[PDB]
Design a binder for this molecule. Structure first.
Ligand SMILES: O=C(O)c1cccc2c1C(=O)N(Cc1c(F)cccc1Cl)C2
Ligand SMILES: [Zn+2]
Ligand SMILES: [Zn+2]
Length: 230
């Protein structure tokens, strides 16, 4: 069973096998007077691992690295953060200290700095216009356009048909819009249309927070966003 928020103490990290060579990582953090769960991705990259997103802070990200070593035992050599919020970049300094080369788009890096969050080291080229895609080892990085944030990226693992939607995609049980302070509500449905057009064969869809599903999460998110606007 996919681990839920009440099952993970703050400071612990779980790994969940999605497909051969693909895991999600699940952590929890104090936020908005509560504790929330948060997902990232781990993808086998030959003899190394590619990490998608931190585990929401330095302490959790240290626990993530320890759990990866215990359960997988291959080195994390690169990480990509999919937008500038702290659930995506908080912990990049720990990753760097562990030998991980950390990456994000130039926009994400600038936005993180202004927000006071940690800053991935390296800039990803080729992702500045909506619909841009680039290969990054065993994944494709895709910029669908503004949605939950202006900089949000999605990640596709072609060998496993896994679409990591990040925070632009809501889990099914989230039926009202969450944090829209950094969102583009008018563009978000169109950005989801771009994701659907690009990845119609996705078999697993991972949201930034909560339970994985399938491509049904895309239409669900569109419906939630539009209901907020209407
Ligand atoms: O999108 C959501 O509604 C959502 C749901 C669960 C958890 C989070 C968000 C969200 O927007 N986070 C960003 C954030 C923030 F906005 C302010 C301070 C710190 C941070 Cl990590 C965290
Ligand atoms: Zn966010
Ligand atoms: Zn988020």
């Amino acid at each position: 069973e996919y681990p839920t928020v009440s099952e993970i103490p703050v400071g612990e990290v779980r790994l969940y096998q999605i497909a051969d060579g693909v895991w999600s990582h699940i952590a929890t953090q104090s936020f908005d007077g509560a504790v929330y769960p948060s997902n990232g991705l781990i993808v086998r990259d030959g003899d190394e691992l590619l990490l998608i997103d931190t585990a929401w802070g330095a302490k959790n990200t240290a626990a993530l690295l320890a759990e990866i070593e215990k359960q997988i035992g291959l080195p994390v050599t690169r990480a990509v953060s999919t937008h500038f919020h702290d659930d995506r970049v908080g912990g990049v300094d720990v990753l760097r200290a562990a030998g991980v080369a950390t990456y994000a788009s130039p926009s994400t890096r600038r936005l993180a700095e202004v927000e006071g969050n940690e800053i991935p080291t390296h800039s990803l080229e080729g992702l500045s216009s909506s619909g841009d895609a680039v290969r990054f080892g065993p994944v494709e990085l895709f910029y669908p356009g503004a949605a939950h944030s202006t900089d949000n990226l999605v990640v596709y693992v072609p060998s496993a048909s896994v679409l990591y939607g990040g925070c632009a995609i809501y889990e099914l049980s989230r039926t009202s819009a969450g944090n829209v302070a950094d969102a583009d509500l008018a563009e978000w449905p169109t950005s989801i249309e771009r994701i659907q057009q690009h990845y119609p064969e996705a078999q697993f869809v991972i949201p930034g927070h909560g339970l994985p599903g399938g491509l049904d999460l895309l239409k669900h998110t569109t419906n939630v966003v539009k209901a907020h606007t209407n």
